[PDB]
């Protein structure tokens, strides 16, 4: 998949495309409709399926540092776009271009001159151009007889509107299961493992992995979650009895160092230290709220209840195998 | 108007004065009673009307950094004192002098030796001298046959005691209208315009002006307010279609960068960038509470409702012309 | 009293001991049971009474910076241990040793090899060894026919379980009286006096002493407390009319500089400045919640009510003379 | 003079302009040559004289926070431009536009479509377009018979090349005399006066005014300088015996702070406190390097030598006429 | 290769090992001698080759934050060890164990009980046990007829002693060529690429990749260097025309930040943005010292000289064969 | 000895005093001359000997945070004054009083009204009153026949002028021997011992005590020094084999911290941890400059040389008798 930053970087010889336009933060189930419609039409005409997206978040252009929390990093937005068969991602920076353009010169410049588009696919809520004057309705009439438009209704399911906003709310409430349901996959973060408390290994109280994320990263509410930890492919040696590319059962503790988030993972039935490695943490279900511990005894007692509840939640998760990982490790007991 | 810092700076040849004593933070309607009484008596005897005030706030002497928020800066206290016809302001620093003095030596030193006072005017709540032993009652009997005293009852109106404290509470609640009612004018701050998001001009989402204030500055609760923005007199060139000394209709957004306050002003129907200029923001009425925005579309939709509600509130404000500005700019519509 | 850091520092020739094991934070009334039982048995056999304790807090080993607030500093834990007749304190660092040891090798290494113990005394809640597998029950059966064990029931009194946790809760609620009741003495902190507002002396609004404590120090909730201030023995000159080693009546103001705590002490009926000195502040009873002051007058009015209420509370405290100080200064009135 | 941010802000109905392009930082004597040729030409054909300038500094686009120090602020660059009769300033942001654009498109878009120039004036060192390929030569050969092009050589005078760089070097070494000579005026900074040491007035040791400047502001080397301070036009009252709009002889002390630079002005033969005013400080000549003081006596002794030496240097500046202030205040002796 | 944290993590069923002990920071050519003798011996008797190394650095145990800069991270020390065929790394923490232990007990516990070594290999400068009393001699005389001991002299080559220290000195002066020569390979750092100036692509001035490193990471002196950048194996898409697993000719700019070090790579003849990838940067030769830029033209001029000089130096590196990358990309001209 | 803050704190019933006025920072041998003449005179006429001193430093009143480093704290200045038999210290704050006061009023108010002095003793360099106009001469001519005035010349000895300044210079260069010689005693700092590297005891490399000092505290140049450490009188238990009130031979390492200065004491031939105690550290002689260590072996090697060299230098200090501690502990060899 090609990734272009700004219209100037798009090749001039690109002859045909089917284009979809949005922030696509989270690539949730609504976003997948747009991507699917786009990829299908591109196959039909032998064109490329292009996603036009935005970075920085268009909101932070007008209101710096008051933009919505990023459900996925931009890099993951790329990976997700690819996984649903997008051929090229054009990334637009509204501080550089396409902000003050009229709806008319936007269609002309972006969809025609730059992308040589024959089809465009947007959500009913899509807007564009100076002061957001261009709507889904504008696009259909500016494009009349120039390129076909397909406006897709916002996705409603089980009485919930599926959007970046609702995914953020579920995450913020700690309801990862509903977030997962809306995303169409386990919500996950990825990151390098740093040193934490003591060492990963024989001791149950020491995390198998510690990770840190900047405050622009959307994360579940502080608490303990059941989920899966996967060491991303690597040739570097791993300390302990975990193998790369296998999804291990884990009780996951999300915290805050006072506004900057930690993820501390206790991998079930494994003695490992993952320092140095890049690790994916998939969230499955909420286990408990954060609590302060009065003693080592009380701490480990609770840690053991976490493990128990996680084993139950994950044994269930594996049965919904469309969202479960391919290769996993979960023991029936300790 | 003369401004003296400490008794030592008051000229020795000053022969007669009518004196009023207080913090006078905000110069609210109660303060105006004292200033009026003082100026009138000074006219009568051909004396100077002197305000003795305090800086730092007397509270912060005993309790550093736990003093009340300053309704006006000291500089504005000066400007306000002048506007009601005070001839000289003596500013007292209790860390330098007049703290450990008995009520007796206070009257002797300040009112007689320093100010050559024939009349003094205080509020019923006025205190002075070591451990605040001197009251309004003390002053009348220490001054018996030495200078005339006039003790003015605290101002009650519409069931509200008008004081610095109540003005702070209204400000803190976001009720600028009641604060304004108590102040006898639109509450305002002044400050240099810095760079903010993008540039002031054609784009509605970009503030016409961004300002920052330290946390000792009393400001309305975070939210959006209707008010008026005035470029203070200047010869420096102005970017866009705003003229100096004219009060422009503006939706004002008060925020916090996390405890340090921003004021972001969206001037109605004008394309301007006020970087470099000194700007006065007058607050008129509360419009809405702060909210987080999920998209550019939702942001501008709300921005447009702000403008609408501001136009209404300001069209009303102009009709109460004792508080409205002399020269204003407000359009009937977009 | 000897103080040893780590098993390596314990003398090899130590021939017999009676040992008690715990964090002992606060040395509350429950802790005193264990210490008393231990000292009594050590007297019987002509052995040394040894306390094994822990530093850092065992919780912070697994969960850095999320450990319980220290009721006493370690230094005070030493002083308290001594005051109840402990002969030696062994301080264990779980990052250095005794964490991954089995219950068996723990008893062998610590109690036998290191301490040459003939008696051990623990609380019913005591645990030890890898993943806290060793309980009070384990200890009795590992030690069968090797050394006598005495497991003491947790102390319940007046429907309250007396523990570090409950003492922290009372402190956190501002209920020092109940904390005191649980500790078996007035809760106190000690620390050097720094410069604060103005100078200690004639002025009532200026603290006699200002102190600062790091955020790991357990302190009562912000507010004003009645208590006693004692200048710890010194040959250094004291400014004003306070003598060392005498416990002076004081209204104590606990605050926060924003999470880092201040203690500002207003010594009743004394003009003193305690800069430079080491000072103990004993807390007796809660007086009022913190409040913001609108004027010097209101501030001193409230300060005077504090003094009044403190005089009452302390006059009562002196009558419970088991917790009252030996030599005190309290005037009947101003 | 108008100020436009980006090509899109430029009036579309602009028929004819004389244009000069450059950073113009400092508006030094070399820059004046460009502006003069442009302005004299503009009042030739009866068109508008336009400056195209850049903010942020083009170097900072590539090396953020490693651009050269601003000789003047952008605000002052505007004011200086206007003083030399520029009719409009167009401000280009290279992060936004005109960056990746080829030399060919740059001339067409900026000079033709946007500005409709009949005449352009650049320095022989002018470079533009993608990868700075376009040079002074490119400009003459791309403007074929459409707009006339006048290329001015860099200014050499007294063996010294006059550039923003050489001005920065002079400033940096503390040679304000040579900086001024290259600038064609006294180097100055402008800023609000804040609080500092004590209060301005009778005491020689307390500054008349304190100002702080960010690390992006070019200032002379740490030390003491002869200069003039002017209170910018204002109706706000002045504490002490200074008028606005008069340049007052001052010894000026420039210090640093572990950003952040301070300017402390000791105004000669005046007792005043300038808190709250906007104040322009002009540098004339270096007096001495910074030094630490061991006693009050030494500081006051040296302070008196600073005044004597300032008195002399400023006398010379008045007689050299050329750069002196129109209205000033300077006593021959104390 | 296995990785064990502490003696307790070592498999208890380990019957036979060949062991080498040392910090091994950098795994330089002197270190390779130790590893080779150990590995060749291990595949002799058919046992495991073990490295005993130390983290944190033993110097930091005594002088926290004053230990020598890490030539490689511990992660890289593992990878290098594995590359030279070490079967297990055992990592000792001196705060935890083997510190206060006498020479006698150190050999028994570590080499015998834990590792069951038949053979140990140390550098002649090896010291161990309490107060570093145990030396290369102690080791031969304490291992009497149990395990054979091979002491290797420090490596001298071309008159230079090869040590972690001499490598650090070379790095520190910017002599990466000599550092590499002592290391036996190109010195490298590895890290995630983050955002920086603009976006990687068409523009020469914007880096292909930006990386930041803590102050504990040894880096060459501030300046520009010839090197190779490699995108570490990944299935994540690459923006622009680079493959993973190919070393690309790059000019490398190493800067500082008032920790904290930056590495900015300008990849030759490629338009790419490497945001989000893990990237290995190899240093070959110094090009020039850091310098400030006065204009875009100068920066681009110098940038082009950096490319020419890199092009040459890298050609020499390819032909010198020995340290060149297996798969690389380098154009002869632009 | 009494301590009074401000003229108002001085007893009103003071009939007769002998007074000395000065900063007295360090109470060096020149200062002792002043105190001696004052004290010998006070026990002459049978009056009180009074020191008038200043806090904050008068230079800091004018140049905040740019005053000279305090040779001793104000606490220590009090203690030293008392040791030389001063009966009362009166501490003047120049921000509060005696600043703008003319020479005439200064003598009347301070020396007469406040202190009722029959005799005053100043250094020939003494200056006072507004703008330091009043000199040693002014004092003799303003005290006409009321109080006798004894002016003492600055102390010259061995060609060196003894002043706070020359002491600071000696300290700053690391020449504590010359500082001590000018002071008349071992320069010392006093402070609570906190935690540092490991724990004090058996290991040579871990300091017996760690102390930190603000940047306002004069300390010898970064490096290692011979000195004596004394545990200040206490009933708190000592961990290890040190008594309070004995000076113990120590090698002293003074470091810096990107304020903030550290003092790490390695007590010779003692295994102890002094956490929590107040500790006085005396400097005798410089041993070496600071250096970085490459290995544990090197650090311990150098540490042993520090001990040998300290052992020698301290032997000389004991025999030179004059400045040695009364009770000390120093072994001839290890």
Author numbering:
A (entry chain A), B (entry chain A), C (entry chain A), D (entry chain B), E (entry chain B), F (entry chain B): 1 to 258, 263 to 338
Sentences from the paper on this structure:
The FAD synthetase from Corynebacterium ammoniagenes (CaFADS) is a bifunctional enzyme responsible for the synthesis of flavin mononucleotide (FMN) and flavin adenine dinucleotide (FAD) cofactors. The C-terminal module catalyzes FMN synthesis from riboflavin (RF) (riboflavin kinase, RFK), while the N-terminal one transforms FMN into FAD (FMN:adenylyltransferase, FMNAT). Bioinformatic tools for the exploration of macromolecular interfaces predict that CaFADS might stabilize in hexameric assemblies in solution, organized as dimer of trimers. In the predicted CaFADS dimer of trimers model, the protomers adopt a head-to-tail organization within each trimer that causes the RFK and FMNAT catalytic sites of two neighboring protomers 6 to be in proximity.
The overall structures of F206W, D298E and E301A CaFADSs are quite similar to that of the WT (A chains r.m.s.d. values 0.149, 0.152 and 0.251 Å, superimposing 274, 309 and 317 atoms, respectively). The D298E structure lacks density for residues 259, 260, 261 and 262. No differences were observed in the D298E CaFADS structure relative to that of WT. Replacement of D298 with Glu allows carboxylic oxygen atoms to maintain their bond with T165 of the neighboring protomer in the trimer. D298 replacement by Ala would prevent this interaction, but in the D298E mutant, the introduced Glu can still retain it. However, the presence of more than one orientation of carboxylic oxygens suggests that alterations to the FMNAT ligand-binding cavity within the dimer of trimers is a factor that determines the low flavin occupancy in the FMNAT sites of these variants. The most significant changes of peak shapes in the spectra were observed when titrating with FAD and FMN, particularly for the F206W, D298E and E301K variants, suggesting different environments of the isoalloxazine ring in the flavin binding site at the FMNAT module.
